[PDB]
Amino acid sequence: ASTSQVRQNYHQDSEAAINRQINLELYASYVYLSMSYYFDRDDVALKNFAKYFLHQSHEEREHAEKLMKLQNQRGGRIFLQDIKKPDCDDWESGLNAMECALHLEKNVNQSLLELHKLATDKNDPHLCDFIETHYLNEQVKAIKELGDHVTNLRKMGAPESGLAEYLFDKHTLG
Amino acid sequence: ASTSQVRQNYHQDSEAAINRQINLELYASYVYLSMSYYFDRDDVALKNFAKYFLHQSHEEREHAEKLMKLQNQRGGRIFLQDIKKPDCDDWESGLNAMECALHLEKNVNQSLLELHKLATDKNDPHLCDFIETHYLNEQVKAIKELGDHVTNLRKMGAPESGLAEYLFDKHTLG
Amino acid sequence: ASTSQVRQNYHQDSEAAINRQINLELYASYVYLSMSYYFDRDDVALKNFAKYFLHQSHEEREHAEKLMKLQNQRGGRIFLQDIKKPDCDDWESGLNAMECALHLEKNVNQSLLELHKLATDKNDPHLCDFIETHYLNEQVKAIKELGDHVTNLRKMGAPESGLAEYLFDKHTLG
Amino acid sequence: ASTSQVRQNYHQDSEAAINRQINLELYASYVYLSMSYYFDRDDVALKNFAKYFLHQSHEEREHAEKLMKLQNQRGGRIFLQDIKKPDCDDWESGLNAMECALHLEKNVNQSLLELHKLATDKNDPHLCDFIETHYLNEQVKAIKELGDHVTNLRKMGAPESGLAEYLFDKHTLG
Amino acid sequence: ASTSQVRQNYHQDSEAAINRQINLELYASYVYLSMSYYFDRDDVALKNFAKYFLHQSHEEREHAEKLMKLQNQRGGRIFLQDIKKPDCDDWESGLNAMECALHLEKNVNQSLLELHKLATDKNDPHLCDFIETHYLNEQVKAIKELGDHVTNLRKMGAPESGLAEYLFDKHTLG
Amino acid sequence: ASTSQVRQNYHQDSEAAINRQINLELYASYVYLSMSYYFDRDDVALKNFAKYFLHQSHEEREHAEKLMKLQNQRGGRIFLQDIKKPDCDDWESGLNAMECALHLEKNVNQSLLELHKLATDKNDPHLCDFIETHYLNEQVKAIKELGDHVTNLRKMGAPESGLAEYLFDKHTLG
Ligand SMILES: [Cl-]
Ligand SMILES: [Cl-]
Ligand SMILES: [Cl-]
Ligand SMILES: [Cl-]
Ligand SMILES: [Cl-]
Ligand SMILES: [Cl-]
Ligand SMILES: [Cl-]
Ligand SMILES: [Cl-]
Ligand SMILES: [Cl-]
Ligand SMILES: [Cl-]
Ligand SMILES: [Cl-]
Ligand SMILES: [Cl-]
Ligand SMILES: [Cl-]
Ligand SMILES: [Cl-]
Ligand SMILES: [Cl-]
Ligand SMILES: [Cl-]
Ligand SMILES: [Cl-]
Ligand SMILES: [Cl-]
Ligand SMILES: [Cl-]
Ligand SMILES: [Cl-]
Ligand SMILES: [Cl-]
Ligand SMILES: [Cl-]
Ligand SMILES: [Cl-]
Ligand SMILES: [Cl-]
Ligand SMILES: [Mg+2]
Ligand SMILES: [Mg+2]
Ligand SMILES: [Mg+2]
Ligand SMILES: [Mg+2]
Ligand SMILES: [Mg+2]
Ligand SMILES: [Mg+2]
Ligand SMILES: [Mg+2]
Ligand SMILES: [Mg+2]
Ligand SMILES: [Mg+2]
Ligand SMILES: [Mg+2]
Ligand SMILES: [Mg+2]
Ligand SMILES: [Mg+2]
Ligand SMILES: [Mg+2]
Ligand SMILES: [Mg+2]
Ligand SMILES: [Mg+2]
Ligand SMILES: [Mg+2]
Ligand SMILES: [Mg+2]
Ligand SMILES: [Mg+2]
Ligand SMILES: [Mg+2]
Ligand SMILES: [Mg+2]
Ligand SMILES: [Mg+2]
Ligand SMILES: [Mg+2]
Ligand SMILES: [Mg+2]
Ligand SMILES: [Mg+2]
Ligand SMILES: [Mg+2]
Ligand SMILES: [Mg+2]
Ligand SMILES: [Mg+2]
Ligand SMILES: [Mg+2]
Ligand SMILES: [Mg+2]
Ligand SMILES: [Mg+2]
Ligand SMILES: [Mg+2]
Ligand SMILES: [Mg+2]
Ligand SMILES: [Mg+2]
Ligand SMILES: [Mg+2]
Ligand SMILES: [Mg+2]
Ligand SMILES: [Mg+2]
Ligand SMILES: [Mg+2]
Ligand SMILES: [Mg+2]
Ligand SMILES: [Mg+2]
Ligand SMILES: [Mg+2]
Ligand SMILES: [Mg+2]
């Protein structure tokens, strides 16, 4: 119960929202992990898709860690939840994985936007700045990159052209 | 259904056991993550406990990844499950965290030993070698290190001596 | 007849099996040699297929040499046999060569697995360790790589697309 | 009585066997020490035989130390015994010393093989791996080297040719 | 049937003769391989004989490869045959191995001379130049070196003097 | 029986005394070896005590070797005896180990002093100089260092303070 000695201008609702966001970032890490190893299957075998999604997975773990650090910086208390498995076991194709990643990042961005709204409603400028500085432009860049990737794959003839996915793997992700 | 072109001498039971082990390693990663940020709380404030457990968390993620790679190398199919949250939100003390980590690593080791027994019963020497080479001695070393740590903390007067935990933090984990 | 001064715990059946395995490795070297120069024909002209299979040929000669060294280390006696010519003179296509290499490596792996079973039945842990350390994971990696290659070529449109085989030659084997 | 906190899957019989093996390695160190200084006598005066056996003596001390470390890693308890003096005070000749070293290393290897059998019967894969990784191939290499040395000395005309032992000292051990 | 686009002034008899020569070079590689590991036996133990013959074995594999490349350069088609095992399993002595190698190289040289005669009869100056440039002087040098070696071993008292073979191993092959 | 060609002014009693001293130095090496691994136990876990005593163990082996060399330099003949196991299996504490080491080094010093008395009574100045130069001041320094260590541990509150032994381990032995 008793307060943290550091706590100031940090609403309990913001504290809870940061714990939800921690879960979401870990969930995103897990989705990209799954995607990565899909492309490492002997019957998929797109090694640069695999590295690309692994890198993205590790990023998301870093995003989670930074929110954990924030929780403590502000005197909130971290409460972890189960990290749900991804929706898919088999991601179908390079294009479909990229489409799923785009939708994931748009979902993560919507959560961060709700979090910023809350921080604004509770007049927490430090939390607003945090989210703006470390998260919002990362999301906009990730979303733009994924859209670019989907566009290229589509134009190249994916998913039906295995050639298209192979060449994208070498030229864009390589 | 149809076979993987790479698959040879890889029993379905071993395939399932590797998927269980993947979950366990990710679970271990999560426990150490939680422990790490506990020591980063302003009311705990043992920064080298925090770094030590973070490093251990990242290790475990690497151990999971290597099993995922193995699954694919052998032509098995990765099936992920929810990563359960840790048993504890509050780890009590440096000593109690170390005790919990020891019990975690002994549990992980017991799983790997059951996995090796299975691999032996199914006459899978490649899988036996894998487990021996990459996992079993890591576990024995981790277990020994954690026991050493618990011993020192106990001898120093933890958990009642906050001095003991502070000085261990600086001299052993620092 | 009279024993080797070094010989210990080395069954005559293991000695014979190692001589068979020596022949098999040299045979594998010969198959890859043949494949290599097929891709060097003026009417095939895929120079990176050619280098890839030449490298694999030299590897296999090294694998044979290490078994010869082992035979002597254990006090067995090397008995060489004719190295049979490969099954094919003309390997048809990049894809078909890769398919044949996959089947070759799976055959070599099955032989090594039978050899390990024998070594296990004769309670020869040094020989078990030898095979595990120097051979079994090499086979699993070779098999996985070849499967990956076959998958890519298939997805790209080989063997009918001469473009697919040309581009694979440059991007994967180059 | 009470258990070690680290102990897992480590049979008391294996614990005792490791203590016996520790004694044997120290015993081997002592035999090579004695051999070394024999060749340093003014009436023997083969300085490279002396260095060769001293190096081998120090190796064996390292092999003992690694088993001591293992005992502790696994939660067993080290119990030392007297290190018996070697069988011989006077080793007769370079050839006879080499012959005695060959028989010593074959004895040490037989002990390690019995130890591996025990570890296998008690389903201790970590201990099996330990012995395989750190000991069995060292023994096979040592045995092969000693056999090679005995062969050369014999072919050269030792022990009757003092010239043979002198020249072996310079060309093989030098 | 249909011609190679590159083929010019390349008689079918020369094409067949190059395929025979390819087999012979691989056969020579195999003889030297066998010789090499004979000297690696614990009861022979002449390590520089072993390295010398291994080097010669690898050379011969290179000589085969260059003929394979030639076949393709000229638009002929490679047809491989079984590589026969060597005549001997046990090479008796350093001197006898050297004598056998001399006879092998003289046989290989006689084949190359017949090949040059054919190339001359078919007015193939490119093939004549090839053989002259890459093969004939190599043979003359190899033959001279082997004769020199046999002479020295004979003068030193081989094969009865094990000392002679030991010292040759160190001073000439070392 | 017959004399060594090198022997001069070297009494048989001195020869025997040097053989006894060789045994004592090896015995000291063994005591420190045992002490070292005691501190490596998971329930003791003082790693710098362990390194300190291991270093001391290796020193003593060097002291033995130098006496063996001396025996031969003077034309005496080395006669080895069993190296007795240490008095203790369990050394109780850092303080008690240090106390036992102090008593060991004082015993070794008393032996060397008796040896010097003998060398003096037999008018062997070379042996007197040997002992003075290589042994007596080493003993005085070792004894002083061990006394210093015991004093510090005692003042710090050992053996009851596990904190004291931990901090000594880091600051003095570290
Ligand atoms: Cl607040
Ligand atoms: Cl609030
Ligand atoms: Cl939950
Ligand atoms: Cl930007
Ligand atoms: Cl299977
Ligand atoms: Cl199955
Ligand atoms: Cl689940
Ligand atoms: Cl280790
Ligand atoms: Cl045997
Ligand atoms: Cl047998
Ligand atoms: Cl045959
Ligand atoms: Cl691997
Ligand atoms: Cl146990
Ligand atoms: Cl037990
Ligand atoms: Cl005893
Ligand atoms: Cl080896
Ligand atoms: Cl023509
Ligand atoms: Cl023609
Ligand atoms: Cl044939
Ligand atoms: Cl010349
Ligand atoms: Cl005298
Ligand atoms: Cl006297
Ligand atoms: Cl005795
Ligand atoms: Cl001083
Ligand atoms: Mg959520
Ligand atoms: Mg891969
Ligand atoms: Mg990202
Ligand atoms: Mg994120
Ligand atoms: Mg669910
Ligand atoms: Mg989706
Ligand atoms: Mg910014
Ligand atoms: Mg589980
Ligand atoms: Mg902090
Ligand atoms: Mg770890
Ligand atoms: Mg793990
Ligand atoms: Mg739950
Ligand atoms: Mg717990
Ligand atoms: Mg290992
Ligand atoms: Mg065969
Ligand atoms: Mg070419
Ligand atoms: Mg290969
Ligand atoms: Mg092979
Ligand atoms: Mg045939
Ligand atoms: Mg085929
Ligand atoms: Mg390995
Ligand atoms: Mg014994
Ligand atoms: Mg000397
Ligand atoms: Mg050795
Ligand atoms: Mg040893
Ligand atoms: Mg006795
Ligand atoms: Mg003997
Ligand atoms: Mg090894
Ligand atoms: Mg022929
Ligand atoms: Mg050798
Ligand atoms: Mg040559
Ligand atoms: Mg040739
Ligand atoms: Mg035949
Ligand atoms: Mg012959
Ligand atoms: Mg020339
Ligand atoms: Mg004594
Ligand atoms: Mg330790
Ligand atoms: Mg000392
Ligand atoms: Mg001493
Ligand atoms: Mg004592
Ligand atoms: Mg002095």
Numbering used by the authors:
A (entry chain O), B (entry chain Q), C (entry chain A), D (entry chain J), E (entry chain W), F (entry chain E): 6 to 179
Paper text:
Finally, we wanted to determine the effect of UVC irradiation at resolutions similar to X-ray crystallography, which allow the visualization of individual amino acids. To do this, we used the protein complex, apoferritin (ApoF). Using the same UVC exposure time as ICP1, grids containing apoferritin were treated with UVC for 60 s on the carbon side and 30 s on the copper side. These grids were subsequently imaged and the data processed using SPA. The UVC-treated ApoF sample resulted in a 2.1 Å structure indistinguishable from an untreated published map. A comparison of the map resulting from a UVC-treated apoferritin sample with untreated, published maps found no difference between the two structures (EMD-3853, PDB5N2717). At resolutions of better than 3 Å, structural damage would likely be visible by the lack of disulfide bonds and damage to aromatic amino acids. Our experiments show that UVC irradiation had no impact on our ability to obtain a final structure of ApoF at a resolution of 2.1 Å. This resolution is comparable to other reported structures (EMD-3853, PDB5N2717).
Additionally, we applied the UVC irradiation to the protein apoferritin (ApoF), which is a widely used test sample for high-resolution SPA studies. ApoF is commonly used in EM facilities to determine the performance of microscopes and it has been well characterized by the scientific community using cryo-EM and x-ray diffraction. ApoF is a common validation standard used in the EM community and resolutions of better than 3 Å are routinely achieved.
